[PDB]
Amino acid sequence: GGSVRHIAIPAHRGLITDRNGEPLAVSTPVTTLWANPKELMTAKERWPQLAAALGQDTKLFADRIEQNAEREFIYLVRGLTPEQGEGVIALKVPGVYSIEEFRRFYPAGEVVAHAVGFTDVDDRGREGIELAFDEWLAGVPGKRQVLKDRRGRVIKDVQVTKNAKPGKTLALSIDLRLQYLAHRELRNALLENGAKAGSLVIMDVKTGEILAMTNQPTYNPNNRRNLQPAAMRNRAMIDVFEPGSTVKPFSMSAALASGRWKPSDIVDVYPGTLQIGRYTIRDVSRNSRQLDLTGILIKSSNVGISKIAFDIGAESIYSVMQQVGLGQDTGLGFPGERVGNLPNHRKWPKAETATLAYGYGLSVTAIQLAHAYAALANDGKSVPLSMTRVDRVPDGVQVISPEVASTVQGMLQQVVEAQGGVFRAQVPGYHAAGKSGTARKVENAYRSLFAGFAPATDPRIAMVVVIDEPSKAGYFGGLVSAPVFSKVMAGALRLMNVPPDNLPTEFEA
Ligand SMILES: *C(=O)[C@@H](NC(=O)/C(=N\OC(C)(C)C(=O)O)c1csc(N)n1)[C@@H]1N=C(C(=O)O)C(=C)CS1
């Protein structure tokens, strides 16, 4: 008797590690109890003890078997241990079977949840890297021939028709050591400032690798019960924000490349406002008259960068921001990753020219902002982004001339180190460079920004800190986000064994 059939052989999903082999997503065995209701219907006397062993009410269990009597497979319980999936088998109930199946476990939990994502109950990638690289990780199921009786019970294992092929190991660009550091410090900053959310991205300016990518709020992917959908957002890639003052270095790059501006050139920003018809550009610090181009960045003068933009024209500024990737497709293919928006016009009036120049009305992601600062730090050369470990670095694209990029770098080192600058971004033992931003959202709500890189002498790491809606008295990016940059950069440089470059001169010793 019986009918010849073919069942599948599940394939083992590939391991995801960090760049150094630390496990991030591992498919490990769990014991699962299943039943063939067609066989169970022949052993009704065994049902009550089976229900009791499974923690089910006898009536509800009997009803469930009756309501599935025409199926040949139902799950009884999933995710037990081999010891537990034997105490039920010890009842020797016909139609009850125990199997070992592989299910994802995430050893770092909430720390890398947004990057890694997760799989569904069938071990298929559903979010994050698990989805983006599902074909790589999934493998290919096998198949084997069986003989099944009239109730669907496998009577004979005949022969394997096709072997299963396991999925492939995938090493991410993430450095788990930096990820933990970034995760902890971003969390600390949210509580320090009573903020609603935040992101922090760390990039290797030489290889394009995303070394760390963390957000708050986050979630435990090992316990996705009653989860908030907002807690699962990889904000660094799928949320957009106005970068504000953090794009002024790119406006400055266009100014320097125009041949009309040098760093020691002077702009008059008195009295701290500039009327453009019915629109008024305003500075926070309004006790300045003449400022040089570095002072414009140190004071973060919207007036100053606006007058420069009028002189060189918006088109030159738009082109730099486009070339460094702001509002442009990263090409990475992360699920839900946003392109943002760099607004364009046929003709640029003064209002649109100024707002472009100081980052108002633009939409970027944290990844884009970090990649743009990586290109600035890398002497103007943009190495393509990667979420996976890069062994052979692809050729970069020269997006800012090396001379202009070097000059802007030095200016941003002064933003961090000069008198009146963003001193909380200073990294002990190293020269650091960057730019703060503070964006008013549409009571006033704010987004606090800092973007930078280090060491200034030979840049290695670019970093972006975004703090969404700090609720304490402090909200400027130089107060809220810069100290996070300092702590995380200091730890990252130490972990990567980068030599300290802030050493005394011969006369300052
Ligand atoms: C750069 O980001 C500048 N920011 C702004 O002009 C914006 N808002 O300014 C404040 C004072 C927060 C306002 O309430 O108007 C802005 C840009 S895009 C958007 N939606 N709002 C200057 N940046 C800093 C800094 O962090 O370095 C300052 C100290 C002065 S404002």
CATH code at position 400: 3.40.710.10
**Quick one: three-class SS letters along 450-490?**
EEEEECCCCCCEEEEEEEECCCCCCCCHHHHCHHHHHHHHH
* Torsion (CA) 465, 470, 473, 477 in degrees, nearest 10: 20
Residues 139 and 204 occupy one common structural domain: no
User: Quick one: tokens of 282?
Assistant: 């305003």
227 within 8 A of 219, measured Cβ to Cβ: yes
Say if residues 434 and 372 touch (Cβ distance below 8 Å): no
At residue 424, what is the residue type? R
Same domain, 81 and 198: no
* CA distance readout (Å), 115 to 27, 28, 99, 102: 17, 20, 31, 21
> In the chain, how many domains are there?
2
How many CB atoms within 10 Å of residue 419?
A: 7
Considering the domain boundaries, does residue 435 fall inside one? yes
Q: Check if 245 has its Cβ closer than 6 Å to any atom of ligand 1.
A: yes
Q: How many C-beta neighbours within 10 Å does residue 306 have?
A: 26
Tell me which residues are annotated as active site. Answer: 245
Contacts of 191 (CB under 8 A, 6+ apart): none
Assess contact for 345 and 352: CB atoms under 8 A: yes
Q: Cβ neighbours of residue 381 under 8 Å, at least 6 residues apart?
A: 375, 396, 397, 398, 399, 402
Q: Which of residues 125, 155, 185 is at a domain's end?
A: 155
151 and 181 housed in the same domain: no
Query: Locate tokens 């509002």: which residue?
Result: 327
Q: Is residue 166 part of a domain?
A: no
* 194 and 70 within one domain: no
Element (H, E) at 170: strand 170-171
One domain for residues 382 and 339:
yes
Q: Does residue 170 lie within any of the structural domains?
A: no
Protein residue with least CA distance to atom 7, ligand 1:
439
What are the residues whose beta carbons fall under 8 Å from the beta carbon of 480, sequence distance 6 or more? 189, 193, 195, 448, 467, 470, 474
Count other C-beta atoms under 10 Å from residue 297's C-beta: 28
Q: Which of 29, 13, 212 is nearest to 108 (CA)?
A: 212
Tell me if 99 is assigned to some domain: yes
User: String of b and e for 162-174 (b: at least 16 CB within 10 Å)?
Assistant: eebebbeebbbbb
Task: Give residue 26's identity as a one-letter amino acid code.
Answer: V
Task: Kindly give, in sequence order, each residue whose CB lies less than 8 Å from that of residue 153, ignoring residues fewer than 6 positions away.
Answer: 36, 38, 39, 95
Residue 439 lies in a domain: yes
- The answer to whether residues 364 and 412 belong to one domain is yes
Q: How far apart are CA 59 and CA 56, in angstroms?
A: 9
Output the domain CATH number for residue 20. 3.90.1310.10
Are the beta carbons of 463 and 201 closer than 8 angstroms?
yes
For ligand 1, the distance from its centroid to the CA atom of residue 384, given in whole angstroms, is 30
Judge contact between 29 and 100, C-beta under 8 A: yes
Same domain, 449 and 410: yes
Deposited experimental method? X-ray
Residues 308 and 433 in one domain: yes
Which residue of 287, 440, 475 sits with most ligand 1 atoms within 8 Å of its CB, as the best mutation to test the pocket? 440
Tell me if 505 is assigned to some domain. Answer: no
Instruction: List the strands of the sheet with 3-9, edge to edge.
Output: 3-9, 142-148, 154-162
- Is residue 363 in contact with ligand 1, taking CB distance under 6 Å? no
Of residues 341, 242, 299, the one with CA closest to residue 435: 299
> Are 199 and 76 within one domain?
no
Resolution of the entry in angstroms: 1.8
Kindly state whether residues 301 and 397 are assigned to the same domain.
yes
Residue 284 burial class via C-beta count within 10 angstroms: exposed 0-12, middle 13-18, buried 19 and up = exposed
- Helix 176-193 vs helix 482-495: crossing angle, to nearest 10: 160
Integer Cα distance of 214 and 128 in angstroms: 13
Give CA angle at 469 (331, 227), nearest 5°. 65
Can you read off the two tokens belonging to residue 306? 């606006």
Q: Are residues 145 and 188 in the same domain?
A: no
Q: Which pair of structure tokens corresponds to residue 216?
A: 């708050």
Do 383 and 488 share a domain, yes or no? Answer: yes
Q: Is residue 320 situated within a structural domain? A: yes
DSSP state of 379: T
Map residue 14 onto helix, strand or coil.
coil
Number of helices (H) and strands (E) in the chain: give both, helices first: 18, 21
Question: Would residue 423 count as lying in a domain?
Answer: yes
Identify the bridge partners of residue 162 per DSSP, sorted by sequence position. Answer: 143
Domain extent for 252: 176-221+234-495
Contact in structure between 170 and 14 (CB atoms under 8 Å)? yes
503 and 465 Cβ atoms separated by less than 8 Å: no
Could you say which of 104, 125, 155 is where a domain stops?
Answer: 155
Residue of 241, 252, 284 to test ligand 1 pocket, by largest number of atoms within 8 Å of CB? 284
Measured at the alpha carbon of residue 448, what is the angle toward residues 489 and 419, in degrees to the nearest 5?
A: 65
